[PDB]
């Protein structure tokens, strides 16, 4: 059933060159391509949350898209909720992973005050996430979405489509994000057609990075295999502006 | 933990101008949009202006539209309101706030400042 | 612009009495109405959002409901600490607007 789990101040880290994804499905190679899209700004302040420290796992704004990343070994983070009022009055998007699969549903979910998944539990998705749900319009099932392992996701909501990008890499850091460039790949395009203004992270009963996308111009460097190996944020500094103008890293 | 503090209030003559600011702390200011609300003595609440988290889109009440400008600086966590061509009718206590909003700004928590008095005479 | 009104503009009630406040919109705003409570010298506090959703920390004696143009705010049993001015506010569209405000006096 629904139970109460619960406010602490935010910490901040730096997304040095993280949050870049392939802007489209067009193959390019051995070329510097200039594109305009919603990307995480370079060297920005990313909010670092500790959901378990006292439980504090707040609802955050979606804005124009969300940059989400986390590092762990136990796989405590299970999924996300995206919607508006996040109750039975509106359609909401529930994305939750388990050991063998991922289930994505859009329904009029009446979510719990402090929603979570139960390791030892109705159904697996219904344990502590919501009390009821009806009028389902979308259902999708596929393969799981989720030293230490760093998992990076970008969530966009454009013209009714909820677009998810992701990357999975090894990490050997404790306090902050890694340096270097790595682009996120398209994961799934979901033809849902709902309003998303806010979101929340679902845990199994924990820390994560949250940033936001901006209308930014980037110069992307594609190697001989069509992989992006670098990028320039054309609105970061005079040096980057010069590099973008001259099309040269 | 969360606070909003207004400053820059004072007394000006009609036709003059006054600039307000609000210092935000205890929360991720740069992820939320912000509102200005004013309340005259003996009167109810009146909404003034809204700015989105990225400092882009700006909205104003018709009663102040064309005279007031809303802006912000996310590197200093400070919200600003620039008041030009002030009238006697603009006398009010001005507040900065993060109003709970499930449609536009995506604000889950409702925050208010202390209020600063702006007098035009 | 959506115009808002409230009735009565003022009411008197004693402790234990049930207090109801009516907020009406000139336009249909579905379920996007906020209710605030203000005492002299302080900024307004949010009690109810989304027409009927209670905020964290708000006493169970407070409630409300409604949809479209006609909404009601209710205090099931007035306490001595509930003497305040209540406001309704719509956030269905921009600009945001507040109603006149209903003052609750102690009888
Ligand atoms: C992960 O989630 C999937 C989908 O909910 C689970 O598969 C279902 O399992 C139930 C039995 O509990 C069956 O009745 C359903 O027909 C299955 N659905 C599908 C699409 O296969 C899966 O068992 C879950 N994995 C774990 C480890 O719990
Ligand atoms: C990030 O926050 C620090 C303060 O801790 C500030 O000095 C810096 O300029 C901010 N950078 C950005 C991009 O906001
Ligand atoms: C189900 O949701 C849709 C919106 O996607 C709405 O139009 C429809 O009326 C809802 N059905 C019921 C029975 O409420
Ligand atoms: C989004 O909200 C608007 C206004 O309430 C509504 O008309 C529309 O149906 C919603 N979109 C969805 C959930 O498809
Ligand atoms: C491109 O792929 C080849 C393998 O076919 C590999 O040897 C080469 O190092 C790759 N180039 C880059 C820049 O990764």
Coordinates of C-alpha atoms and ligand atoms in Angstrom, one line a residue:
Chain A
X1 CA 0.0 0.0 0.0
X2 CA 0.9 3.7 0.1
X3 CA 3.0 4.8 3.1
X4 CA 4.7 8.0 4.2
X5 CA 8.5 8.0 3.9
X6 CA 9.2 11.7 4.5
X7 CA 13.6 18.8 3.4
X8 CA 17.3 19.1 2.8
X9 CA 19.2 21.8 0.7
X10 CA 20.7 20.8 -2.7
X11 CA 24.3 20.1 -3.5
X12 CA 26.0 21.1 -6.8
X13 CA 28.4 19.4 -9.2
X14 CA 29.7 20.4 -12.7
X15 CA 28.6 18.7 -16.0
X16 CA 31.9 19.4 -17.7
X17 CA 31.0 18.1 -21.2
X18 CA 28.2 15.7 -20.4
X19 CA 24.6 15.5 -21.8
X20 CA 25.2 15.4 -25.5
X21 CA 23.3 13.0 -27.7
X22 CA 22.9 12.2 -31.4
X23 CA 20.5 15.0 -32.6
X24 CA 18.9 12.8 -35.3
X25 CA 19.1 9.4 -37.1
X26 CA 21.2 10.6 -40.0
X27 CA 24.6 8.9 -40.5
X28 CA 27.6 11.2 -40.7
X29 CA 31.3 10.5 -40.7
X30 CA 34.7 12.3 -40.9
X31 CA 32.9 15.6 -40.6
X32 CA 32.2 18.6 -38.3
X33 CA 28.5 19.2 -38.2
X34 CA 26.7 22.2 -36.7
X35 CA 23.3 21.5 -35.1
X36 CA 20.8 23.4 -33.0
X37 CA 18.8 21.4 -30.4
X38 CA 18.1 21.1 -26.7
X39 CA 21.3 20.0 -25.0
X40 CA 22.9 20.2 -21.6
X41 CA 25.1 23.4 -21.5
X42 CA 28.8 22.7 -20.9
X43 CA 30.4 23.5 -17.5
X44 CA 26.9 24.0 -15.9
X45 CA 25.8 23.6 -12.3
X46 CA 23.9 20.2 -12.0
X47 CA 21.9 19.5 -8.9
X48 CA 23.2 16.5 -6.9
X49 CA 20.5 14.8 -4.8
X50 CA 20.8 12.3 -2.0
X51 CA 17.4 10.6 -1.7
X52 CA 18.5 8.3 1.1
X53 CA 20.6 10.1 3.8
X54 CA 16.2 10.7 6.5
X55 CA 14.3 10.2 3.3
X56 CA 14.0 13.2 0.8
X57 CA 13.1 12.5 -2.8
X58 CA 11.3 15.6 -4.0
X59 CA 9.3 16.3 -7.2
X60 CA 11.3 18.2 -9.7
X61 CA 10.3 20.4 -12.8
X62 CA 10.6 18.9 -16.3
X63 CA 11.0 22.2 -18.1
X64 CA 12.1 21.7 -21.7
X65 CA 13.7 18.3 -21.0
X66 CA 15.7 16.6 -18.2
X67 CA 19.3 15.5 -18.0
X68 CA 19.5 12.6 -15.6
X69 CA 22.5 10.6 -14.4
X70 CA 23.4 8.3 -11.6
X71 CA 26.3 6.1 -10.4
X72 CA 25.7 3.0 -8.3
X73 CA 26.1 -0.8 -8.0
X74 CA 23.0 -1.9 -6.2
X75 CA 20.6 -0.6 -8.9
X76 CA 18.4 1.2 -6.3
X77 CA 16.9 3.6 -8.9
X78 CA 14.2 1.7 -10.8
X79 CA 12.4 4.2 -12.9
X80 CA 10.7 7.6 -13.3
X81 CA 7.3 9.3 -13.3
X82 CA 6.5 12.0 -15.8
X83 CA 3.3 14.1 -15.9
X84 CA 1.5 17.2 -14.6
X85 CA -0.7 16.8 -11.5
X86 CA 0.6 13.3 -11.1
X87 CA -2.8 12.1 -9.9
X88 CA -6.0 10.3 -11.3
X89 CA -7.3 13.5 -13.0
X90 CA -4.7 13.4 -15.8
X91 CA -2.8 10.9 -18.0
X92 CA 0.7 10.1 -16.5
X93 CA 3.7 8.2 -17.8
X94 CA 5.1 5.5 -15.5
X95 CA 8.5 4.0 -16.5
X96 CA 9.7 1.2 -14.3
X97 CA 12.4 -1.4 -14.7
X98 CA 12.9 -4.9 -13.2
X99 CA 15.3 -7.8 -13.4
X100 CA 14.2 -9.1 -16.8
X101 CA 12.2 -6.3 -18.6
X102 CA 11.0 -2.7 -18.6
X103 CA 7.3 -1.7 -18.6
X104 CA 6.1 1.6 -19.8
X105 CA 2.4 2.6 -19.2
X106 CA 0.3 5.7 -19.5
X107 CA -2.8 5.7 -17.3
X108 CA -4.7 7.9 -14.8
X109 CA -2.5 6.8 -12.0
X110 CA -3.3 7.9 -8.4
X111 CA 0.3 8.0 -7.1
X112 CA 1.3 7.5 -3.5
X113 CA 2.5 10.5 -1.5
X114 CA 6.0 9.1 -1.4
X115 CA 6.0 6.5 -4.2
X116 CA 8.5 3.6 -4.4
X117 CA 9.1 0.0 -5.4
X118 CA 9.1 -3.0 -3.0
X119 CA 12.0 -5.4 -3.2
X120 CA 9.9 -7.9 -1.3
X121 CA 6.2 -7.7 -2.3
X122 CA -1.3 -6.5 -6.6
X123 CA 1.7 -6.5 -9.0
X124 CA 5.4 -5.5 -8.8
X125 CA 4.6 -2.0 -10.2
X126 CA 1.7 -1.5 -7.9
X127 CA 3.4 -2.0 -4.5
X128 CA 4.1 1.5 -3.4
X129 CA 4.0 3.5 -6.6
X130 CA 0.2 4.0 -6.8
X131 CA -3.1 3.0 -5.1
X132 CA -5.0 2.6 -8.4
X133 CA -4.9 3.3 -12.1
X134 CA -7.5 3.4 -14.9
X135 CA -8.2 4.6 -18.5
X136 CA -4.8 3.3 -19.8
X137 CA -4.0 4.6 -23.3
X138 CA -0.4 3.4 -23.9
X139 CA 1.6 0.3 -23.1
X140 CA 5.1 -0.7 -24.1
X141 CA 7.3 -3.6 -23.0
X142 CA 11.0 -4.1 -23.9
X143 CA 14.5 -4.9 -22.5
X144 CA 15.7 -3.2 -19.2
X145 CA 16.9 0.4 -19.4
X146 CA 18.9 0.2 -16.1
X147 CA 34.4 0.3 -9.7
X148 CA 30.8 1.5 -10.3
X149 CA 28.6 1.9 -13.4
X150 CA 27.5 5.4 -14.6
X151 CA 24.1 5.6 -16.3
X152 CA 23.2 8.7 -18.3
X153 CA 19.7 9.5 -19.7
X154 CA 18.1 12.4 -21.5
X155 CA 14.4 12.9 -21.5
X156 CA 12.7 15.0 -24.2
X157 CA 9.0 15.7 -24.9
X158 CA 8.4 17.2 -28.3
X159 CA 5.2 17.1 -30.4
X160 CA 3.7 14.4 -28.3
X161 CA 6.8 12.1 -28.5
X162 CA 8.7 11.2 -25.3
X163 CA 12.2 10.6 -26.6
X164 CA 14.7 8.8 -24.5
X165 CA 18.5 8.7 -25.0
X166 CA 21.0 6.7 -23.0
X167 CA 24.6 5.6 -22.4
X168 CA 26.1 3.0 -20.1
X169 CA 29.8 3.3 -19.2
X170 CA 32.2 2.2 -16.3
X171 CA 33.3 4.8 -13.7
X172 CA 35.9 5.0 -10.9
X173 CA 34.9 8.2 -9.3
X174 CA 33.1 8.9 -6.0
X175 CA 32.5 12.6 -5.6
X176 CA 31.8 14.1 -9.1
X177 CA 31.2 13.5 -12.8
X178 CA 34.0 12.3 -15.2
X179 CA 35.8 14.4 -17.8
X180 CA 35.8 13.5 -21.5
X181 CA 33.2 13.3 -24.2
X182 CA 30.7 10.5 -24.8
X183 CA 27.4 10.9 -26.8
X184 CA 24.2 9.3 -25.8
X185 CA 22.3 7.1 -28.3
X186 CA 18.6 7.0 -29.0
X187 CA 16.9 4.3 -26.9
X188 CA 13.1 4.6 -27.7
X189 CA 10.6 6.9 -29.3
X190 CA 7.3 6.7 -27.5
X191 CA 4.2 8.0 -29.4
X192 CA 2.3 8.9 -26.2
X193 CA 0.7 12.4 -26.7
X194 CA 0.5 13.6 -23.1
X195 CA 1.5 16.8 -21.1
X196 CA 4.7 16.6 -19.0
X197 CA 5.6 19.5 -16.7
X198 CA 7.1 17.6 -13.6
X199 CA 8.8 14.4 -12.8
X200 CA 9.9 12.2 -9.9
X201 CA 12.5 9.4 -9.4
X202 CA 11.4 5.9 -8.3
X203 CA 13.6 3.9 -5.9
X204 CA 13.5 0.3 -4.6
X205 CA 13.2 0.1 -0.8
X206 CA 20.3 6.5 -3.6
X207 CA 21.7 9.7 -5.2
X208 CA 21.4 11.3 -8.7
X209 CA 22.3 14.3 -10.9
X210 CA 19.6 16.5 -12.4
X211 CA 20.2 19.1 -15.1
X212 CA 18.1 20.8 -17.8
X213 CA 18.3 21.2 -21.5
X214 CA 18.6 24.5 -23.3
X215 CA 18.3 25.8 -27.0
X216 CA 22.1 25.6 -27.7
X217 CA 24.2 25.4 -30.8
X218 CA 26.9 22.7 -30.9
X219 CA 29.6 21.7 -33.3
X220 CA 29.8 17.9 -33.3
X221 CA 32.9 16.1 -34.4
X222 CA 32.2 12.7 -36.1
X223 CA 35.1 10.2 -36.6
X224 CA 35.6 7.7 -39.4
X225 CA 33.1 5.3 -37.8
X226 CA 30.3 8.0 -37.5
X227 CA 30.9 8.2 -33.7
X228 CA 30.9 11.7 -32.1
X229 CA 34.2 12.0 -30.3
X230 CA 34.0 15.7 -29.3
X231 CA 31.7 18.8 -29.2
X232 CA 31.9 22.6 -28.9
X233 CA 29.4 24.6 -27.0
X234 CA 29.1 27.7 -29.2
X235 CA 27.7 29.8 -26.3
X236 CA 30.2 28.8 -23.6
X237 CA 33.0 31.3 -24.2
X238 CA 34.8 33.4 -26.9
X239 CA 37.2 30.5 -27.6
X240 CA 34.3 28.1 -28.4
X241 CA 32.6 30.9 -30.5
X242 CA 35.7 31.1 -32.6
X243 CA 36.0 27.3 -33.0
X244 CA 32.3 27.1 -34.1
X245 CA 32.7 30.1 -36.5
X246 CA 35.7 28.6 -38.2
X247 CA 34.4 25.1 -38.1
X248 CA 37.6 23.9 -36.4
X249 CA 38.3 22.3 -33.0
Chain B
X1 CA 16.2 25.9 4.7
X2 CA 14.5 27.7 1.8
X3 CA 14.3 31.5 1.8
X4 CA 13.5 34.4 -0.5
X5 CA 14.6 38.0 0.4
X6 CA 13.4 41.1 -1.3
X7 CA 15.4 44.4 -1.4
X8 CA 15.7 47.7 -3.2
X9 CA 12.4 49.2 -2.0
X10 CA 12.1 53.0 -1.4
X11 CA 10.1 56.1 -2.2
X12 CA 10.0 57.7 -5.7
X13 CA 8.0 60.4 -7.5
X14 CA 5.4 59.6 -10.2
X15 CA 7.0 59.2 -13.6
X16 CA 10.2 57.9 -12.0
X17 CA 11.6 54.3 -11.7
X18 CA 12.6 51.7 -9.1
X19 CA 14.4 48.4 -9.4
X20 CA 13.7 45.5 -7.1
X21 CA 15.7 42.4 -6.5
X22 CA 15.2 39.1 -4.6
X23 CA 17.9 36.8 -3.3
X24 CA 17.1 33.1 -3.5
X25 CA 18.8 30.3 -1.5
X26 CA 18.1 26.8 -0.1
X27 CA 16.8 25.5 -3.4
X28 CA 17.6 25.1 -7.0
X29 CA 16.6 28.6 -8.1
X30 CA 18.0 28.1 -11.6
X31 CA 15.6 25.2 -12.4
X32 CA 12.4 27.1 -11.4
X33 CA 10.5 30.0 -13.0
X34 CA 9.6 32.9 -10.8
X35 CA 6.7 35.2 -10.1
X36 CA 6.3 38.7 -8.8
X37 CA 3.1 39.5 -6.8
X38 CA 2.1 42.8 -5.2
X39 CA -0.4 43.8 -2.6
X40 CA -1.5 47.4 -1.9
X41 CA -2.6 48.4 1.7
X42 CA -6.2 47.4 2.2
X43 CA -6.3 45.4 -1.0
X44 CA -6.1 41.7 -2.1
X45 CA -3.3 40.0 -4.0
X46 CA -2.4 41.0 -7.6
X47 CA -0.1 39.1 -9.9
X48 CA 2.5 41.2 -11.7
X49 CA 4.9 39.1 -13.8
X50 CA 6.4 35.7 -14.6
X51 CA 9.8 34.6 -16.0
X52 CA 10.8 31.1 -17.1
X53 CA 13.7 29.3 -15.5
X54 CA 16.1 29.9 -18.4
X55 CA 15.4 33.7 -18.4
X56 CA 13.8 33.5 -21.8
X57 CA 10.0 33.9 -22.1
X58 CA 8.6 36.8 -20.1
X59 CA 4.9 37.4 -19.2
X60 CA 3.2 40.5 -17.7
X61 CA -0.1 41.6 -16.3
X62 CA -1.9 44.0 -18.6
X63 CA -1.9 46.6 -15.9
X64 CA 1.9 46.7 -15.9
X65 CA 2.6 45.4 -19.4
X66 CA 4.9 47.8 -21.3
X67 CA 6.1 49.5 -18.1
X68 CA 7.6 46.7 -16.1
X69 CA 10.5 44.3 -17.1
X70 CA 11.2 41.0 -15.5
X71 CA 14.7 39.5 -15.6
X72 CA 17.0 37.1 -13.7
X73 CA 20.6 36.1 -13.2
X74 CA 21.0 32.4 -12.5
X75 CA 24.7 32.7 -11.6
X76 CA 23.8 34.9 -8.6
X77 CA 20.5 33.2 -7.8
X78 CA 18.8 36.6 -8.0
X79 CA 15.5 37.7 -9.5
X80 CA 15.0 41.3 -10.7
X81 CA 12.0 43.6 -11.5
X82 CA 12.6 46.9 -13.2
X83 CA 9.9 49.5 -12.8
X84 CA 9.6 52.4 -15.2
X85 CA 7.1 55.2 -15.5
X86 CA 5.8 54.4 -12.0
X87 CA 2.3 55.7 -11.0
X88 CA 0.6 56.4 -7.7
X89 CA -1.5 53.3 -8.3
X90 CA 1.7 51.2 -8.2
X91 CA 2.1 51.7 -4.5
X92 CA 2.2 48.2 -3.0
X93 CA 4.3 45.6 -1.1
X94 CA 6.2 43.6 -3.7
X95 CA 6.9 39.9 -3.1
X96 CA 9.0 37.4 -5.0
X97 CA 7.6 33.9 -5.0
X98 CA 7.7 30.4 -6.6
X99 CA 4.0 29.6 -7.1
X100 CA 2.9 26.0 -7.2
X101 CA 2.3 25.4 -10.9
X102 CA 1.3 22.1 -12.7
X103 CA 1.0 23.6 -16.1
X104 CA 3.8 26.0 -17.0
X105 CA 6.8 26.2 -14.7
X106 CA 6.4 22.7 -13.1
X107 CA 6.8 24.1 -9.6
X108 CA 5.9 21.6 -6.9
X109 CA 6.8 23.7 -3.9
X110 CA 5.2 27.0 -3.0
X111 CA 7.7 29.6 -1.7
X112 CA 7.3 33.3 -0.7
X113 CA 9.6 36.1 0.4
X114 CA 9.0 38.7 3.1
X115 CA 7.8 41.6 1.0
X116 CA 9.3 45.1 0.3
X117 CA 7.2 48.3 0.2
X118 CA 7.4 50.5 -2.9
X119 CA 5.9 53.9 -2.6
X120 CA 5.1 56.4 -5.4
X121 CA 4.4 60.0 -4.3
Chain C
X1 CA -7.7 37.2 -19.1
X2 CA -9.8 35.2 -16.7
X3 CA -11.8 37.2 -14.2
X4 CA -12.3 35.8 -10.7
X5 CA -14.8 36.6 -7.9
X6 CA -15.5 35.3 -4.4
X7 CA -18.6 35.3 -2.2
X8 CA -19.2 36.3 0.5
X9 CA -16.5 39.0 0.7
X10 CA -16.7 38.6 4.5
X11 CA -18.2 36.2 7.0
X12 CA -18.3 35.8 10.7
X13 CA -18.1 32.5 12.5
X14 CA -17.2 31.1 15.9
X15 CA -15.0 28.2 16.9
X16 CA -16.5 24.9 15.9
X17 CA -18.6 26.4 13.1
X18 CA -18.3 25.2 9.5
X19 CA -17.1 27.8 7.1
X20 CA -17.6 27.7 3.3
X21 CA -16.2 30.1 0.7
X22 CA -17.3 30.3 -2.9
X23 CA -14.9 31.1 -5.8
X24 CA -16.2 31.5 -9.3
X25 CA -14.2 31.9 -12.6
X26 CA -15.5 33.8 -15.6
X27 CA -14.0 31.0 -17.7
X28 CA -13.7 27.2 -17.3
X29 CA -10.4 26.4 -15.6
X30 CA -10.9 22.7 -15.1
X31 CA -9.1 21.8 -11.9
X32 CA -6.3 24.3 -11.8
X33 CA -7.2 26.4 -8.8
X34 CA -5.0 27.3 -5.8
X35 CA -6.3 28.4 -2.4
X36 CA -4.2 30.6 -0.1
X37 CA -4.5 31.8 3.5
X38 CA -3.0 35.1 4.6
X39 CA -2.6 36.8 8.0
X40 CA -1.6 40.4 8.5
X41 CA 2.1 41.1 8.2
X42 CA 2.9 37.9 6.4
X43 CA 3.0 36.5 2.8
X44 CA 0.1 34.1 1.7
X45 CA 0.4 30.4 2.5
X46 CA -0.8 27.7 0.1
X47 CA -3.3 25.2 1.6
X48 CA -4.9 23.6 -1.4
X49 CA -3.8 23.0 -5.0
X50 CA -5.3 21.4 -8.1
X51 CA -8.8 22.3 -6.8
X52 CA -8.8 19.6 -4.1
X53 CA -5.2 18.4 -3.3
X54 CA -4.1 19.1 0.2
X55 CA -0.5 20.4 0.8
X56 CA 1.9 18.8 3.2
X57 CA 1.5 20.0 6.8
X58 CA -2.0 21.3 6.2
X59 CA -4.5 20.2 9.0
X60 CA -7.1 17.6 8.0
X61 CA -9.9 20.0 8.9
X62 CA -9.2 21.8 5.7
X63 CA -10.8 20.6 2.4
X64 CA -12.2 21.7 -0.9
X65 CA -13.6 20.6 -4.3
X66 CA -15.0 21.8 -7.6
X67 CA -14.5 21.8 -11.3
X68 CA -14.8 24.2 -14.2
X69 CA -16.1 27.5 -13.0
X70 CA -17.5 26.8 -9.6
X71 CA -15.2 25.9 -6.7
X72 CA -15.7 25.7 -2.9
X73 CA -13.3 26.0 0.0
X74 CA -14.3 24.4 3.3
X75 CA -13.2 24.5 6.9
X76 CA -15.0 21.6 8.6
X77 CA -14.5 23.1 12.1
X78 CA -13.2 26.6 12.6
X79 CA -10.3 26.9 15.1
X80 CA -9.3 30.2 16.9
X81 CA -6.1 30.1 14.8
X82 CA -8.1 30.1 11.5
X83 CA -8.9 33.8 11.5
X84 CA -7.4 34.9 8.1
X85 CA -8.2 36.1 4.6
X86 CA -8.5 33.4 2.0
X87 CA -7.8 33.8 -1.7
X88 CA -8.5 31.7 -4.8
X89 CA -6.1 31.8 -7.7
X90 CA -6.2 30.3 -11.2
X91 CA -3.2 29.0 -13.1
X92 CA -4.9 27.6 -16.1
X93 CA -3.4 30.3 -18.3
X94 CA -1.3 33.4 -18.2
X95 CA -1.6 36.0 -16.8
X96 CA -2.4 34.5 -13.4
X97 CA -5.1 36.1 -11.4
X98 CA -6.4 36.2 -7.8
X99 CA -9.9 36.7 -6.6
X100 CA -11.0 39.6 -4.3
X101 CA -10.3 37.6 -1.2
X102 CA -12.7 36.5 1.5
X103 CA -12.2 37.7 5.1
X104 CA -13.1 35.4 7.9
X105 CA -13.9 37.2 11.2
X106 CA -14.2 35.8 14.7
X107 CA -17.8 35.8 16.0
Ligands
LIG1 C1 9.2 -7.8 -15.0 O1 8.0 -7.3 -15.5 C2 7.3 -8.2 -16.5 C3 6.0 -7.5 -17.0 O2 5.2 -7.1 -15.9 C4 6.9 -9.5 -15.8 O3 6.3 -10.4 -16.7 C5 4.9 -10.8 -16.4 O4 4.9 -11.8 -15.3 C6 3.5 -12.1 -14.9 C7 3.6 -13.1 -13.7 O5 3.9 -12.4 -12.5 C8 2.8 -12.7 -16.1 O6 1.4 -13.0 -15.7 C9 2.7 -11.7 -17.2 O7 2.0 -12.2 -18.3 C10 4.2 -11.3 -17.6 N1 4.1 -10.3 -18.6 C11 5.0 -10.3 -19.6 C12 5.0 -9.3 -20.7 O8 5.9 -11.2 -19.7 C13 8.3 -10.2 -15.3 O9 8.0 -11.4 -14.7 C14 9.0 -9.2 -14.3 N2 10.2 -9.8 -13.9 C15 10.5 -10.0 -12.6 C16 11.8 -10.6 -12.2 O10 9.7 -9.8 -11.7
LIG2 C1 28.0 27.5 -10.5 O1 27.9 27.9 -9.1 C2 29.1 28.6 -8.6 C3 28.9 28.9 -7.1 O2 29.1 27.7 -6.4 C4 29.3 29.9 -9.4 O3 30.5 30.6 -9.0 C5 29.4 29.6 -10.9 O4 29.6 30.8 -11.7 C6 28.2 28.8 -11.4 N1 28.3 28.4 -12.8 C7 27.3 28.4 -13.6 C8 27.5 28.0 -15.1 O5 26.2 28.7 -13.2
LIG3 C1 -9.3 8.7 -21.0 O1 -8.3 9.7 -21.3 C2 -8.6 10.5 -22.5 C3 -7.5 11.4 -22.7 O2 -6.4 10.8 -23.3 C4 -10.0 11.2 -22.3 O3 -10.3 12.0 -23.5 C5 -11.1 10.2 -22.1 O4 -12.3 10.8 -21.9 C6 -10.7 9.4 -20.8 N1 -11.7 8.3 -20.6 C7 -12.5 8.4 -19.5 C8 -13.6 7.3 -19.3 O5 -12.4 9.3 -18.7
LIG4 C1 -3.0 18.8 -21.9 O1 -3.7 19.8 -21.2 C2 -4.7 20.5 -22.0 C3 -5.4 21.6 -21.2 O2 -6.0 21.0 -20.1 C4 -5.7 19.5 -22.6 O3 -6.6 20.2 -23.5 C5 -5.0 18.4 -23.3 O4 -6.0 17.4 -23.6 C6 -3.9 17.8 -22.5 N1 -3.1 16.9 -23.4 C7 -3.1 15.6 -23.3 C8 -3.0 15.0 -22.0 O5 -3.2 14.9 -24.3
LIG5 C1 37.0 2.8 -36.3 O1 36.7 1.4 -36.3 C2 37.9 0.6 -36.5 C3 37.5 -0.9 -36.6 O2 36.9 -1.2 -37.9 C4 38.9 0.8 -35.3 O3 40.1 0.1 -35.5 C5 39.2 2.3 -35.3 O4 40.1 2.6 -34.2 C6 37.9 3.1 -35.1 N1 38.3 4.5 -35.1 C7 38.0 5.3 -34.0 C8 38.4 6.8 -34.0 O5 37.6 4.8 -33.0

